[PDB]
Design a protein around this ligand. Structure first.
Ligand SMILES: COc1ccccc1-c1cc2c(c3c1C(=O)NC3=O)c1cc(O)ccc1n2CCCO
Length: 252
């Protein structure tokens, strides 16, 4: 042995299951490094993650990429470490103490992730798996990470993201407005941060949201903000705002 991994980095802890928090011996900084079994169609998919990061490195609201390499039966990617953990962990803690993101904090989240998404989309890519466990926290700063489902906007083939966040047209394999799939998952992401119950994976409550009905939110929001979220989940993708229209919205 003597991995590049072993020799260039000191591993501190496992943070995801694998992803490790690591100090780079030479530069003194902390990075998150994912080590996955090297895969083929499964390899094409793994390399899109790398090609996506290598073009999505210049934005404040997308997690930065440093390097990627292969050794053994393993593939490695070294990203920016985000010391605030994921939004899914923040939301789960808030659930427990019954104190949620307040309206101003939900607007900040929506606008920051909105701007990462605007950038992603102006590179003719779509993220395809927007959800709280793929938003990282670092002013709070929210950064989109986990680019493993990224594809080009006009892709005829798509790997679908988490079903709790998945828009119906993508499930029906109508990929004509893929960017609006990211808009749909971002609304539901903000609904979780606001304090809603866990989203359903299927069944009758899944279809109700997909009819355009907001899950119940245990706090009082302005009619305006609520209107914006509702239109972000409209069953007709053409009605949802683009990320461009979103970051320039009056409500934000
Ligand atoms: C190479 O890393 C990845 C490669 C591909 C996909 C995701 C990650 C990932 C996971 C990640 C964190 C961080 C990243 C990242 O790219 N930058 C981070 O900072 C991070 C930071 C943290 O403070 C606590 C937990 C945690 N996880 C796992 C949790 C997943 O929900």
């Amino acid at each position: 042995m003597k991995s590049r991994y072993t020799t260039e980095f000191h591993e501190l802890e496992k943070i995801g299951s694998s992803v490790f928090k690591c100090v780079k011996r030479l530069d003194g900084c902390i990075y998150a490094i994912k080590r996955s079994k090297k895969p083929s169609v499964d390899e094409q998919n793994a390399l899109r993650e790398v090609y996506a990061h290598a073009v999505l490195g210049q934005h404040s609201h997308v997690v930065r990429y440093f390097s990627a390499w292969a050794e053994d039966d393993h593939m490695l990617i070294q990203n920016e470490y985000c010391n605030g953990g994921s939004l899914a962990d923040a939301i789960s803690e808030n659930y427990r103490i019954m104190s949620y993101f307040k309206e101003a904090e939900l607007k900040d989240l929506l606008l920051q992730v909105g701007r990462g998404l605007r950038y992603i989309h102006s590179m003719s890519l779509v993220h395809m798996d927007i959800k709280p466990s793929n938003i990282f926290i670092s002013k709070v700063m929210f950064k989109i990470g986990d680019l493993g489902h990224v594809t080009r906007i006009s892709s005829p083939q798509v790997e679908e993201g988490d079903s709790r966040f998945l828009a119906n047209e993508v499930l029906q394999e109508n990929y004509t407005h893929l960017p609006k799939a990211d808009i749909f998952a971002l609304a539901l992401t903000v609904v979780c941060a606001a304090g809603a119950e866990p989203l359903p994976r299927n069944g009758d409550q899944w279809h109700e949201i997909r009819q355009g009905r907001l899950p119940r939110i245990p706090q009082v929001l302005s009619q305006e903000f609520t209107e914006l979220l509702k239109v972000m989940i409209h069953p007709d993708p053409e009605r949802r705002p683009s990320a461009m229209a979103l970051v320039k919205h009056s409500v934000l």
